């Protein structure tokens, strides 16, 4: 991501843009000039600090014009789980913003290559009425980005079937270690949580409550990134990493489990009843401001 | 690119890896474990110094092991034109090493999302007899990256029919400006060249010698990035930028044959005779392994 090259963006539709972060109050004017009426910011505070972006100044400047509304809907960077968890409420807020403001919608994260593309893809999928893979093919033809299709599929299933959590136990045999923690899982790759050394077993142990799906994680052993060979692992993935994974299954025979299987396909064929339920959920979501 | 997560890589073929930079001497052992016999490093010293990587220690540790060799053959980061210029010599240097060393080859840059995939792709295309787009499809199914297909296509034409530069003139009407520069073209987006104001015309002018291709550029006017609307522009591009572009097409020639239509296409159709000559020429372009 080339910050110094300035704010970059892509028209996906005449009413929808996916782009990088606003850097100065002047960027608000550039967007007003192209008919943007909604600035949908997905950035967290630490993301703005790293590049020295004064968000409050940008917000205050956007407040001066009723023409254009600035909205913050935080999603954690570098965290596929938070994406999944946040998509329902985030798109809800986006859905109410577009209905209220119209014009052109500017959806942005920091780089506009992860969070922003995923949110816009989800919106096109649930609200605009596109098939997932067809909207994906459109987005990719316009902008070099890496949206998490798995996260979008899972958020869709989470709305329709609900969230079913089970206890997941992660273990690592101690070989004279002092400090052991994992990253990824449901806390993201920019974060770590410590495991505890079992007094009886001599294994480092971690317990997490996780919904259905597959979650990649890696160990940090005395400040050394590594995967446990005694636990299931996958890769090298498309980011080039070999990670451990935990898989969570409830019951595929169940009616909620059947819909999960159908909607876990690459291009999920969504029922008319299911599409109506998605909209019903978005109407539940709270308007910004 | 996330450097904190350590070295990342992907097998493209059983004997070809595209990865990110080695960070510690320990990473040589990592690669020795999976049968790597050539570490092919495309990074420049400013790439390494930015991430605090001690390349000398990595080279020294690799020199200790006879089964693995470390080669430095640099290409500028974030420079699509330099990439185009460097490919013949780089792929030629790569080719000689692999033929001698065998085993698994590790092609890497800083992130392994720009230079490294482009070089591996070019290597598969020029040397291993892949069609460009077939090799590309394989690469993309393994690793997320942005190779510059345009740079590879143009380098192929450069070798096969020659690098011929022509004068392009870029102009910008003055409206009380004091400083006018251009970024992009053949210098990259991290560099800029100053234009000169014509006293008679009231236009800022740039004369540039450029080979065949399409060259995106932008003006920087009193510090501000902007495209000239009185000149041809396209975008937003795949990176989210709206740029002017200059287009250079070679003069027609009596010995063009069918070369022009075959090579300019999305998936360049190479004659067997051309592939055979191309590989041979690549060797003559190779650089000292140092």
UniProtKB/Swiss-Prot annotation, chain A:
Going by the UniProt record, its keywords in alphabetical order are: Carbohydrate metabolism, Chloroplast, Hydrolase, Plastid, Protein phosphatase, Transit peptide
Annotated knockout phenotype? Reduced plant size, slightly delayed flowering, leaves with large round starch granules and starch in excess.
What does the record list as GO biological process? starch catabolic process; starch metabolic process
Q: What is the effect of changing residue 240 to R?
A: Loss starch-binding capacity
Question: Which terms in the Gene Ontology molecular function aspect does this entry carry?
Answer: amylopectin binding; carbohydrate phosphatase activity; phosphoprotein phosphatase activity; polysaccharide binding
- Give the residue range of the signal peptide: none
Q: What is known of its domains?
A: Contains a C-terminal polysaccharide-binding domain which interacts with the phosphatase domain; this interaction is required for glucan phosphatase activity.
Which miscellaneous remark does the UniProt record hold? Starch binding efficiency is dependent on pH and redox conditions.
Q: What is this protein called?
A: Phosphoglucan phosphatase DSP4, chloroplastic
Species of origin reads: Arabidopsis thaliana
């Amino acid at each position: 991501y080339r910050h110094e090259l300035g704010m970059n963006y892509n028209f996906i539709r005449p009413d929808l843009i996916v782009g990088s972060c606003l850097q100065t109050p002047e960027d608000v004017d550039k967007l007003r000039k192209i008919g943007v009426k909604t600035i949908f910011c997905l950035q967290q505070d630490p993301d703005l600090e790293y590049f020295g972006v004064d968000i409050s100044s940008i917000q205050a400047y956007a407040k001066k014009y009723s023409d254009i509304q600035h909205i913050r809907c935080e999603i954690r960077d570098f965290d596929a789980f938070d994406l999944r968890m946040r998509l329902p409420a985030v798109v809800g807020t986006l859905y109410k913003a577009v209905k209220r403001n119209g014009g052109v919608t500017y959806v942005h994260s920091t780089a506009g290559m992860g969070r922003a593309p995923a949110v816009a893809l989800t919106y096109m999928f649930w609200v605009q009425g596109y098939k997932l893979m067809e909207a994906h093919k459109l987005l990719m033809s316009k902008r070099s980005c890496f949206p998490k299709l798995d996260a979008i599929r899972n958020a869709t299933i989470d709305i329709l079937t609900g969230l079913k959590r089970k206890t997941v136990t992660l273990t690592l045999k101690d070989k004279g270690f002092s400090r052991v923690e994992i990253s990824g899982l449901d806390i993201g790759w920019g974060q770590r949580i410590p495991l505890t050394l079992g007094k009886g077993t001599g294994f480092w142990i971690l317990k997490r409550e996780l919904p259905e799906g597959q979650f990649e994680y890696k160990y940090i052993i005395d400040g050394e990134w590594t995967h446990n060979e005694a636990e299931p692992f996958i890769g090298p993935n498309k980011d080039g990493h070999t990670n451990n994974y935990a898989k969570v299954v409830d019951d595929p025979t169940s009616v909620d489990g059947t819909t999960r299987e159908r909607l876990s396909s690459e291009d999920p064929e969504l029922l008319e009843e299911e599409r109506s339920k998605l909209i019903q959920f978005l109407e539940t979501c709270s308007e910004a401001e």
